[PDB]
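Reopening: structure tokens for the 2-acetamido-2-deoxy-beta-D-glucopyranose complex, inputs below.
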Amino acid sequence: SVLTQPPSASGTPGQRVTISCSGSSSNVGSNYVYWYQQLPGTAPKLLIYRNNRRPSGVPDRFSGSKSGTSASLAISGLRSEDEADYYCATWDDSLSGLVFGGGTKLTVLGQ
Amino acid sequence: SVLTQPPSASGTPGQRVTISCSGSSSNVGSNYVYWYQQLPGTAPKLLIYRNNRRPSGVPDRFSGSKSGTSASLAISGLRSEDEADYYCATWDDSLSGLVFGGGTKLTVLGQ
Amino acid sequence: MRCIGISNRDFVEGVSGGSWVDIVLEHGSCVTTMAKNKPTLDFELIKTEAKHPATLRKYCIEAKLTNTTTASRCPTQGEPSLNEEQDKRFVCKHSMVDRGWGNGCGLFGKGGIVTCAMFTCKKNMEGKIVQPENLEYTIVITPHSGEENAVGNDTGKHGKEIKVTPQSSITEAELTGYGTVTMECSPRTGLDFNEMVLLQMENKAWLVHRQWFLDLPLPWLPGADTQGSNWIQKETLVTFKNPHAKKQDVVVLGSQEGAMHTALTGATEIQMSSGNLLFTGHLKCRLRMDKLQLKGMSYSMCTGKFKVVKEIAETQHGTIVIRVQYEGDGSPCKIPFEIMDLEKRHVLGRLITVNPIVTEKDSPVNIEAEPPFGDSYIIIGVEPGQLKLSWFKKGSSIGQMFETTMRGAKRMAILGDTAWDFGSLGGVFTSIGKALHQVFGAIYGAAFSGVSWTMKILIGVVITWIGMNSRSTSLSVSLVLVGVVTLYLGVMVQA
Amino acid sequence: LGRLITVNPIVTEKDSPVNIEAEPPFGDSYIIIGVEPGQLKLSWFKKGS
Amino acid sequence: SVALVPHVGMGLETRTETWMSSEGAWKHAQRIETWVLRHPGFTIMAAILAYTIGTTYFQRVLIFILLTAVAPSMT
Amino acid sequence: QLVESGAEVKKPGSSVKVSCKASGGTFNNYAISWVRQAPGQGLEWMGGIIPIFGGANYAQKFQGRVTITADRSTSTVYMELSGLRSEDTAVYYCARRPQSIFDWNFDLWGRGTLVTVSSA
Amino acid sequence: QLVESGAEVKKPGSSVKVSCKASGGTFNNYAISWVRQAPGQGLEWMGGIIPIFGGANYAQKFQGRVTITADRSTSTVYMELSGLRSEDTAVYYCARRPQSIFDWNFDLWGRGTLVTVSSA
Ligand SMILES: *[C@@H]1O[C@H](CO)[C@@H](O)[C@H](O)[C@H]1NC(C)=O
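Re-run output (same inputs, fresh job):
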């Protein structure tokens, strides 16, 4: 339940943006971390499953990093389409349930 | 899997033309391959039976070929008589039936 | 997490001169084979497909009578005649009725009457047969590595599937990092499909005995019919009524589906909708470990802290599985693992997931080990941060000896003489035991075919009593043993 | 374990099937056809006694 | 009826659960018990006949059990 | 010699029976198969029969729709089509082959009976 | 292959049963969990079900107020939420997961189902 994510993110095209969401040992360190990109008015889409795995059909621009107790989603080749809300999902044992990150706003200087 | 042949075949008189019969190991390569020469408005005439065998009373211009999984029928010298549909037939073990090549018409030139 | 927690798990340990072991694979069971210097592997026969069936007979389970007609002749004037009795679509019966001036002809007495009705079948159960060469067994071989299985139910990625058919006696599978596993199964001495019918009735199928299926008292078609109108014993599915010797009527019996569901009490249910794929039976295989090697033996031991992400869990099979995570450097390395005593002086337990290794830092690794009965400590990692996790087995060696004896006795009750093939390293004692079992089981199967478990209990009690009250000690011992084995088989049957 | 009846089987032509008759033993036996590079081994079981 | 010839003693059983194994395990005993309850008169006659025919207690009990089991079965 | 019955005009949903008489030697020592060819299309095997033995074999496409029979007294082979449709319009041949499961050489053919569902 | 019931406006204190129609493959092989996202807010995990095993587990925030059930006959998963309030106004998602204790990758997602709560 302590899993925190930066509420908003800013980036320019072709400029890697790191969305780092931290948590407790059980929350994030002790479990896999899933990253979902949710365009407005659409269901969340799986980006990184387990720790650094990209589902088939997901482009290589997105990458998953997992620290000791924090995980970060790396965005290479930032584009206007990438603008969306991002979350990191991880089961945490103390709460005995799935905990979602607060989400991050991909504020991109496109327009 | 099933017998496949080129829909049409061209040639010139006094030429050598080979028609290919391609199938799966279930039908071609595990059984004999039979070649039939059918003229328009006439019952098919057995041309090659078993493999590379010519029924008694057939000219030597016709020669069949059997590969591990594919078969071919070759013509020694070409004429206007050779213009006719050619079919390859082979027993299929999985289909539990006889499968025909589908047809191959020899289009001799010289019109 | 495929063969762990399946509760029908056998640990096959060791190989023979030649690096092969004998294992019988059952559908609901599992086999874990361990040999020194070789990776532990899990085996599971998960699918048996029978292809290209031939309908042997089509039975009618529900009929309708239409076009009923009757004929009669005056007494002493012979049988009546119906044209319909010419056609075999009509089920006919002859009877007698009282006739007289009131009934409508010349003299008094029992006249002849023939009633016929057109038999039509609305629902049938189709019995199909397969040739043993057309069987196909799917066996999954998953290296017992401890590497977390990829997304799915083990159907893809980790776990290699091999199809065992009677066309090829050698089945070969390449496990990346472990070499090649060769299996020489025998899909001809398994179910014995020449004696088996594949009976399907209504979105349900059963594997049934062939003679039993041919003895079913229902109307049937030859199986080569293609017309579906000339049923053989229609009189099993109709009843003719002559309550008062006044007139004859024919009614049709009701749907036989429930009575056939009752008749199928001991048969094993299979699937016949999307192909003839069944999930019962075994497959004796010879496992060849010649080209099997431990994976990651070139890696160095991990120098870094391990954290237990999932707490140690006792398995159903007297083993413990612990999930650990790596935080150190040198990503692909060997997890330093041991089960020792309190003083860390003696090694007390065997690691089942031999040669555990952390391929990537992020991914946890499930290690399975078999601790000893009592106190043991699972040591994990080098001294800085080394984990020392206590465990208590809660059992006894005598208890497991009795439990394994019971498991082997049950295997003999299920596999017959094929039980001796289980974990057999080509021994001579096993060969003689299997020959004696073959003779004894032949005699037993002759003497006990077609009897129920209550009948087996009664016979076992009777034979035990006959042996007990016998003057000859040798005959006494023989009869008591036969009775006790029969009682065990009766108690352990019908499942 | 068993003896072949089509004594001295020989391939007269490449794509010309040849069908051998053998007498296998009672019980389990294996028919081995060819040499090691691509040898095929065929399981068989004879039901009698 | 086909229900009177179940697929019981065929020697095909595996470790897999059979069609109605648990349900059909004790149905015969239940039916025999219910019949013996509904028809006490035949059970007494069977006991008397078993005693009359059986020389030893084993023979008497065997005959009594067989008669009591067959009586419902033949119906 | 292999003589076939005359051409027949049928209607959708009806049935047509095609006969193919044969000599005594070819009836009792060979097998007879039925192959159709829709106009402008390749030959299609429907089935066959060993007249001495009976019990015809049918192609999967025509399973349940065709019935091949042999009249031993008249030494004639019969073919019956049920559920005729427009796509079933084609010329039907009766061909003679050896009665062995491996050899399928139709060294002798009938002239062929054409079944049409339109007017002539 | 995850179909959700249509949007339905409720009233405070009422109940709503969102339906997730799964396919034959996912019902017997995967697990399914219910995630609701408030309008302009982050995702929240309510509960999850393994249809062949039942016994859904719920988040502490919703334990005692929501109930997930699976209809094996129709291969459907149901989410019932009681005591609806304005805080319960949000789109509800049913997603598929690998059914392992450690696998929580929602490869498949539903189109969503919007539930509106207000006093009107
Ligand atoms: C059965 O009765 C129906 C209805 O009268 C009739 O159309 C049909 O021809 C009859 N069938 C026979 C075989 O008599």
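Residues 8 and 56 of chain E are 33 Å apart (CA to CA). Chains E and D do not touch (no CB pair under 8 Å). Marking as resolved unless the reporter disagrees.
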